[PDB]
């Protein structure tokens, strides 16, 4: 443990999650891949 040391640890963040836009882009990419394959 650290007493006053600032490097003795590192508190996590809220959550390592992206925005809705990145999820939409990933879904669109997967869908385009699957559709090209399908066709």
């Amino acid at each position: 443990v650290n007493n006053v040391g600032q490097f003795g640890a590192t508190e996590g963040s809220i959550g390592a999650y992206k925005q809705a836009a990145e999820y939409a882009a990933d879904s669109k990419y997967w869908a385009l891949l699957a559709e090209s394959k399908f066709g």
Partner: protein
Amino acid sequence: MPDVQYPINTYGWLKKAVALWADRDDDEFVNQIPNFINFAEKEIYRNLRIPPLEKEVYLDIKDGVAYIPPDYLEAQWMMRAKDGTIFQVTSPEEISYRRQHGNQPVNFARFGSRFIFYPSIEADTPYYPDDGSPLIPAENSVILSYYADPPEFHEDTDTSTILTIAPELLLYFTLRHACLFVQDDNGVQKWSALGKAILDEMVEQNKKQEYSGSPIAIPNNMTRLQSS
């Protein structure tokens, strides 16, 4: 009324030390101690900038649309993982000018909730539903260092570096809002002063920590490297 151990390590013991250090403890009061602690931590992280709350992560530029992560509060050094290169931030107008008028330096800006880059960057990262797979980060992989918003306490066993490094800070900044909830001003002022003093000490420590291994003397840099 309640008891507590010497080290205030967790939320469970902090919410009891709060009621201890303020004899104003009862049903209608203890139930809101979480709200006072929430307000205190918000007032703290709103301007506190230190390493332990930092976070490094790779980005996906996609030549433009690149988006700002949710935990973005302030950006530290930004660079790559290949031979090293530091970006510099400029205004939208500079980038709009660079676009038409025209690759050693690389700039970037902040368009709402995006990070724009003049060159058509092609940084790559694994998609969202990827399972593990560190992926052995490929080239052209920019690494961003910023200050991330820490999590809010939700369980008595939940701890944080602030508790193990400086619990009196949280205790005072929350006794402030406690003595505000009830009618009391002297305690409010004293606790506010003490919390501000602790925060000043911490930020001064952070300051004396940076660039603290030797003096500096600019060696008359006049771009010795011009040939390229």
